[PDB]
């Protein structure tokens, strides 16, 4: 029914180097801050548009 | 010795001293009204003539009380303004000024990141002090002091321009003079224009006048 995987961890690793080309390479949340979720909320709630965001 | 109160409260950054000679006043008619003229001048700093704001670091001198020997003349409602009102007059001649209160900011934030941070901080009338790495970290700390009006934002526009990798605290740490003369009406300011550093403090000296609900302008005088 393939509902499931378990894998190695030498598995990930291949899997994660072979995908770095469609990977951010970002260890944070940081680099999201004023421009995530929340943020898109309350200016959408606010009647303002972030510069380079949704309006 | 001739120390009579310590500012507005206990421990106010102003200093209230008698110079009154013993021949010149009687000391035992002066001691009548010192307690008195130390509640007018702790009354008088607690307002301040200039925007109704605190006094600091200013040494009050008296030079000469002459005393009514009556009792009757002295005391109460009667001494007490006369005295809130010389101590106006008196801070008035010496050039006044204004104090801003200036905050301290600790910046974390990489190698690269430390020249945008010092952009940031150029525009708000910053003054960088020190950057250093953290030993053992690949990050840096830059301590910097920036005036605390001159903040509003400075923590978004710090973590916008350098993509969320710089992030700052700041907390108040000592005042410091506005670089203007309050008292200066050759000075035209616009109502909706950020003024230069020459003249900023007639900006914030009438500006809070108007906040305060007060008249336009002071009256020096005696």
């Not at chain 2, 003349?73 to 007490?80: A, L, P, T």
């Not at chain 2, 007059?89 to 945008?116: G, H, I, K, W």
């Not at chain 2, 910053?126 to 790495?133: C, R, S």
């Not at chain 2, 309050?182 to 230069?196: A, C, M, N, Y």
């Amino acid at each position: 029914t393939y509902q499931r995987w378990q894998f190695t961890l030498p598995m990930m690793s291949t899997l994660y180097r072979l995908a770095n080309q469609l990977l951010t390479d970002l260890v944070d949340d940081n680099y999201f801050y004023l421009f995530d979720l929340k943020a898109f909320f309350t200016s959408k709630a606010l009647n303002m548009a972030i510069p380079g965001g949704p309006k | 010795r001739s120390i009579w109160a310590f500012g507005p409260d206990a421990t106010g950054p102003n200093i209230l001293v008698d110079d009154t000679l013993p021949s010149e006043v009687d000391k035992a008619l002066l001691g009548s009204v010192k307690d008195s003229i130390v509640q007018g001048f702790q009354w008088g700093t607690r307002e301040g003539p200039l925007c109704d704001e605190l006094i600091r670091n200013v040494k009050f001198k008296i030079l000469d009380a002459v005393v009514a020997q009556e009792p009757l003349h002295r005391g109460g409602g009667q001494i007490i303004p006369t005295a809130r009102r010389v101590v106006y007059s008196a801070f008035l001649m010496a050039t006044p000024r204004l104090m801003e209160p200036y905050y301290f900011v600790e910046v974390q934030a990489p190698a690269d990141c430390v020249s945008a941070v010092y952009t940031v901080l150029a525009r708000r009338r910053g003054h960088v002090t020190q950057d250093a790495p953290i030993p053992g970290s690949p990050l840096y700390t830059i301590k910097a002091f920036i005036p605390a009006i001159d903040s509003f934002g400075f923590e978004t526009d710090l973590r916008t321009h350098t993509q969320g990798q710089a992030f700052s605290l700041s907390v108040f740490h000592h005042w410091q003079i506005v670089p203007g003369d309050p008292l200066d009406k050759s000075i035209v300011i616009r109502p909706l224009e950020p003024q230069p550093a020459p003249h900023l403090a007639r900006e914030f000296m009438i500006k809070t006048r108007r906040r305060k609900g007060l008249s336009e302008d002071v009256s020096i005088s005696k």
